[PDB]
Write a protein that binds this ligand. Sequence first.
Ligand SMILES: *[C@@H]1O[C@H](CO)[C@@H](O[C@@H]2O[C@H](CO)[C@@H](O[C@@H]3O[C@H](CO[C@H]4O[C@H](CO[C@H]5O[C@H](CO)[C@@H](O)[C@H](O)[C@@H]5O)[C@@H](O)[C@H](O[C@H]5O[C@H](CO)[C@@H](O)[C@H](O)[C@@H]5O)[C@@H]4O)[C@@H](O)[C@H](O[C@H]4O[C@H](CO)[C@@H](O)[C@H](O)[C@@H]4O)[C@@H]3O)[C@H](O)[C@H]2NC(C)=O)[C@H](O)[C@H]1NC(C)=O
Ligand SMILES: *[C@@H]1O[C@H](CO)[C@@H](O[C@@H]2O[C@H](CO)[C@@H](O)[C@H](O)[C@H]2NC(C)=O)[C@H](O)[C@H]1NC(C)=O
Ligand SMILES: *[C@@H]1O[C@H](CO)[C@@H](O[C@@H]2O[C@H](CO)[C@@H](O)[C@H](O)[C@H]2NC(C)=O)[C@H](O)[C@H]1NC(C)=O
Ligand SMILES: *[C@@H]1O[C@H](CO)[C@@H](O)[C@H](O)[C@H]1NC(C)=O
Lengths: 408, 408
Amino acid sequence: QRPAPCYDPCEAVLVESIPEGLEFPNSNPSTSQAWLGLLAGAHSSLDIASFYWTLTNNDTHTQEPSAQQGEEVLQQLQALAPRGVKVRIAVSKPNGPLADLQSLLQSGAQVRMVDMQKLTHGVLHTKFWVVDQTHFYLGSANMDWRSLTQVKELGVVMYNCSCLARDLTKIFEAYWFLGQAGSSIPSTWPRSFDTRYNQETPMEICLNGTPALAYLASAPPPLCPSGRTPDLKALLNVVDSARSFIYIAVMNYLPTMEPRRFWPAIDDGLRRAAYERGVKVRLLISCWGHSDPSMRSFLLSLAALHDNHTHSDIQVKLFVVPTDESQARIPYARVNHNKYMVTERASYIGTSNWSGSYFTETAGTSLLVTQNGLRSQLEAVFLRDWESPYSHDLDTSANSVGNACRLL
Amino acid sequence: QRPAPCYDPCEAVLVESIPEGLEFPSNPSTSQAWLGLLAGAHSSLDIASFYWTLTNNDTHTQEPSAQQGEEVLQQLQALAPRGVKVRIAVSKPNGPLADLQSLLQSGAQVRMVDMQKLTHGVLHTKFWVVDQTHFYLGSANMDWRSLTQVKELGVVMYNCSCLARDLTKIFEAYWFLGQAGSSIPSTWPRSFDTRYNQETPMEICLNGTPALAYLASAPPPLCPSGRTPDLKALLNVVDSARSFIYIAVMNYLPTMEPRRFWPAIDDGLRRAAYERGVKVRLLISCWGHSDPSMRSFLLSLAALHDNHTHSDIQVKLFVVPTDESQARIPYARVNHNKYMVTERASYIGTSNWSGSYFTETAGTSLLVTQNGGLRSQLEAVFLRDWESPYSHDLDTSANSVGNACRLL
Ligand SMILES: *[C@@H]1O[C@H](CO)[C@@H](O[C@@H]2O[C@H](CO)[C@@H](O[C@@H]3O[C@H](CO[C@H]4O[C@H](CO[C@H]5O[C@H](CO)[C@@H](O)[C@H](O)[C@@H]5O)[C@@H](O)[C@H](O[C@H]5O[C@H](CO)[C@@H](O)[C@H](O)[C@@H]5O)[C@@H]4O)[C@@H](O)[C@H](O[C@H]4O[C@H](CO)[C@@H](O)[C@H](O)[C@@H]4O)[C@@H]3O)[C@H](O)[C@H]2NC(C)=O)[C@H](O)[C@H]1NC(C)=O
Ligand SMILES: *[C@@H]1O[C@H](CO)[C@@H](O[C@@H]2O[C@H](CO)[C@@H](O)[C@H](O)[C@H]2NC(C)=O)[C@H](O)[C@H]1NC(C)=O
Ligand SMILES: *[C@@H]1O[C@H](CO)[C@@H](O[C@@H]2O[C@H](CO)[C@@H](O)[C@H](O)[C@H]2NC(C)=O)[C@H](O)[C@H]1NC(C)=O
Ligand SMILES: *[C@@H]1O[C@H](CO)[C@@H](O)[C@H](O)[C@H]1NC(C)=O
């Protein structure tokens, strides 16, 4: 027996940050405008799951005009509680004090810091916003001014979708519980955290005026209540159900536990899809000066499967954001942070890079949607990026790419 | 509680077939060992076999190099009239076999196992059990080519009655299924079961020093309760290795040769190399009949050799040269060897390394651990072959190899 259907008029918008200087002779609203609109409409509540906070020039020891959007975001955040909006912030436990969070505290917001390292030996990596139990953002953008103007980002805003937003709030509530000082993960979570919407029975929603199936997946497994699909299971179900193509854009990909362990769950899913079903796989991996060089061997290993006897067809490119003389002075910028997957039948938008810890120890969430739309728009972003001059084959020269790339 | 130790004076001898013309800078030949066993037989002979082409008449040839195979058939014909009870199990042929007609007329018993109806595989196993005392197990078929025109690797275990009687239970499974209408019991009668397996191996005296030995079996429906499956035994050798893994097999393929991807061994090797720094060397045979789909999978493995991960996987192809006269012999001039050696353990098998051999087709393997010996001799066979001019890297030119090779 399926759970109750939803009648809210849900509308989904893909939201991107395109770094200054990147041009794509060819648009989605930017992450900055979507966040400021959400904040301007907020009247009752805001829940933010976050990794770190650097919204200001002072935070990064810089004097960049590019930080203005981030600075504006922070100002609108400080204004929320004094106008009646209950703000709750969950952040991964930091090394030093955070100024953004101290300002938010003095404006009346609540903050708890989640020590995922003690609980599970991971971090709180999830990025999402839940606003007025009605709208949500979920995607790759951190609370970082660079994430608006100097690095590439992909996420989704779901508007007017209370059924799904309350479902996200259950995940946030797990974080909020573990943010108290003496908290320990329960053996069995209270029934209030549980959901009836999952891979087996997704939520039936109206999405842009058309029926669709949607659910939210969660990581790590100790944070998953009884009926919540694990993130790895949802991702692999998409990989395994594909019959025509699998397009993947992710910042890092590694079939390992980044004592070292080999971790082939995703890698074997792609090998299987291509050999048994002839599905076309395209893998778009980001590269900058901080890329883990051990990525190259595994990527070459996949690309060897492209072969006219098995008729398997797997292809890999690297996406590199060019940096000019002034931009190279910005710390930790000029990269592509996207983490998403689209097939001929399904969409997957996530907060986690594709290696084992994000699926066994670290916090993450993903949104899964099936419809007969958002899918075609996600495929359009992927093809634009894959065909741009910013994407390069594994044999490309490292000086011909516009930025440092260890994988070349 | 371990089973009873054995006090038989077991002695193991590596036995090889070296094709005419192949030269190396030496173990007894398959032919000599088989002739000694046949002349000494006094009470019983069991042969598990794939096919029978011991004579020139069988292959429609006039080769003098067939004489050894013909002598073998002659000496087999002398067994029954001397009182030796001969039982031959053969994979169900697609036509009459003259060898088997002549053996029936001399008094031997012959049964044909239709594994295709039983499990959708074949009866691929090659072994001899002699007087419940000695056995041959290896790659050589009942084929005169297997003595002089193809490269073979096997073992003869002499004076080891406990282990030979253990092999006879496997043969008895074939003999039962060689009757018409036999159906493979859901649980085998207790007489087929064994106490010697991966968990508690037979304790033997091997060349005067203690050793641990057991015999593994395929496919799973022919395995009674205490019999280790072939795949489990092979994978345990791969996972226990700490220094190196040397494998020489005629075919290797991570699939079910409706198409299925089959990564059990492949992921074993990837894990060994990444997690434990194990040096894996893979020596694959190549001739004009090689499945071309092998090359892409082998390239995928060789891509893991990297100075960042420190994984060290290497692949060579072994090609037996042929001169103009030899190319007239049908289905010859290849290396049929199937074995694995580590710094700790020996594995000698009858199966090629692809999925059907472990799920549907009959096979047997011998696993030995000892604290030098058989292990060091197998490693010496491998290193000789690996450093010989008959071994070539994946980028070698097809014209420089001495024979047709599909993977180059
Ligand atoms: C695995 O183990 C077996 C042992 O079981 C071993 O085979 C033996 O190998 C040795 C060589 O190293 C052979 O030794 C030769 O034997 C010649 C005489 O053979 C006759 O006498 C044998 C001894 O009989 C005594 O012991 C038995 C058992 O205890 C007992 O019943 C008797 O009453 C008696 O006390 C006898 O075993 C043997 O019987 C076999 O053969 C007959 C005929 O084929 C057959 O009917 C039987 O059923 C049985 O199979 C036979 O009766 C001897 O002349 C010869 O001496 C010459 O050679 C040596 C060296 O070459 C010179 O030094 C010497 O100067 C002479 O020129 C030699 O001693 C022995 O016969 C083998 N036994 C068998 C059964 O074959 C294998 O080597 C082991 N395998 C491995 C790989 O190591
Ligand atoms: C679902 O409806 C929303 C709301 O109208 C659409 O969002 C618009 O998308 C276009 C480009 O795709 C933007 O230029 C507009 O600014 C967006 N509007 C808002 C309010 O953000 C969305 O495109 C629709 N989804 C589909 C699949 O058509
Ligand atoms: C174990 O004992 C057997 C019995 O002698 C050894 O077999 C001999 O091995 C040498 C070298 O390979 C050959 O020249 C002989 O022909 C073999 N004898 C027989 C009867 O075939 C075997 O080598 C020993 N194993 C070890 C590790 O020492
Ligand atoms: C959501 O609902 C509001 C008011 O109910 C409506 O005005 C708006 O256009 C809808 N869509 C979005 C994206 O907010």
